[PDB]
Write a protein that binds this ligand. Structure first.
Ligand SMILES: CN(C)c1ccc(C(=C2C=CC(=[N+](C)C)C=C2)c2ccccc2)cc1
Lengths: 186, 186
């Protein structure tokens, strides 16, 4: 809880002032904790931040569990999952803190460890989509892991770089992509 | 030089550190110049940046033409472009900086119009490839602009978010993508 209170406050601080601007000092004081306790729990602001990210990852996964029920078939889950990825990121408060962070630890190969266990978790969502797709003859992929890393990165690119259009066009392009992609698997 | 030495240091810092990460102070101090050195041509920092992007875009689009000749069919031109995208030293090594600049200059509509031509030179390569593929009957695509953007963005994704894993693994994926994509247009 004192740990949970720190992550909560830290998350808000980041959302409000971004990664670089937030200090562990602010965090310590606002969560009514101590430099010692924050050290014992996270060691560094970077670690603190990766922990928020993990928690955030969990929530996303959980939501997806409830949300994927609106998609009977896996072809549908693929369509749905990509759209959510697009819309939900449009209004995600942490997005900017993430970007600061990511484009700040691109050089540090130390963070590359947890940073990757995290990304892998996101790819599993797709991995599951495709596997189940196989066991239902929705398509036939023999290199799932591969197709999974590809979708995850192709879709995130559309989400991250399309930024330059009206939300409708984007959902449109994204659905066109999902269409093409799922097609080239038959 | 100087007007071309600034650009040199700037590009270097933008790539290495990041957009916000580097400021008009560092650029000058590291280029053996003065603050006044910027006014007529390089007014604002965002102008100096939008500059470097134009250069790099041209340098990459040029390298591409001096190399697409190794591809007879457009089907091959598609695959190639994507692979080269992973190996170049032009434009793509700045995506991270670009992503920030778009999260700190998306409001000021002074940019959304300023570097609007930049978004076209980026999707142009695929425009030609996809259009010329129609004439050559390699495929039948009606919504070219869509596909060009979908592809341009998906690809930038595979390139930007795999920057840490084995270059061969990268090129392998990029190829399975190109494979999957084009096959979905038929
Ligand atoms: C709020 N939200 C749903 C999300 C928020 C972020 C991501 C991301 C990402 C991109 C490629 C990945 N792969 C395929 C390794 C993993 C994560 C990501 C986006 C920008 C900068 C760094 C990572 C995905 C979903």
């Amino acid at each position: 809880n004192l740990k949970d209170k720190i992550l909560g406050v830290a998350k808000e601080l980041f959302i409000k002032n971004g990664y670089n601007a937030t200090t562990t000092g602010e965090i310590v004081k606002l969560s009514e904790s101590s430099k010692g306790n924050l050290y014992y729990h996270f060691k560094t602001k970077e670690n603190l931040f990766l922990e928020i990210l993990n928690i955030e990852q969990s929530k996303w996964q959980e939501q997806w569990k409830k949300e994927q029920i609106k998609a009977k078939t896996n072809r549908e889950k693929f369509y749905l999952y990509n759209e959510l990825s697009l819309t939900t990121e449009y209004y995600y408060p942490l997005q900017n803190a993430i970007i600061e962070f990511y484009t700040e630890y691109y050089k540090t190969n130390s963070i590359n460890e947890k940073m990757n266990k995290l990304e892998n978790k996101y790819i599993d969502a797709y991995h599951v989509i495709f596997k189940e797709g196989n066991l239902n003859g929705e398509w036939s992929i023999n290199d799932v892991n591969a197709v999974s890393k590809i979708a995850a990165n192709a879709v995130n690119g559309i989400v991250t770089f399309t930024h330059e259009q009206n939300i409708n066009e984007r959902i449109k392009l994204m659905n066109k992509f999902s269409q093409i992609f799922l097609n080239g698997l038959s």
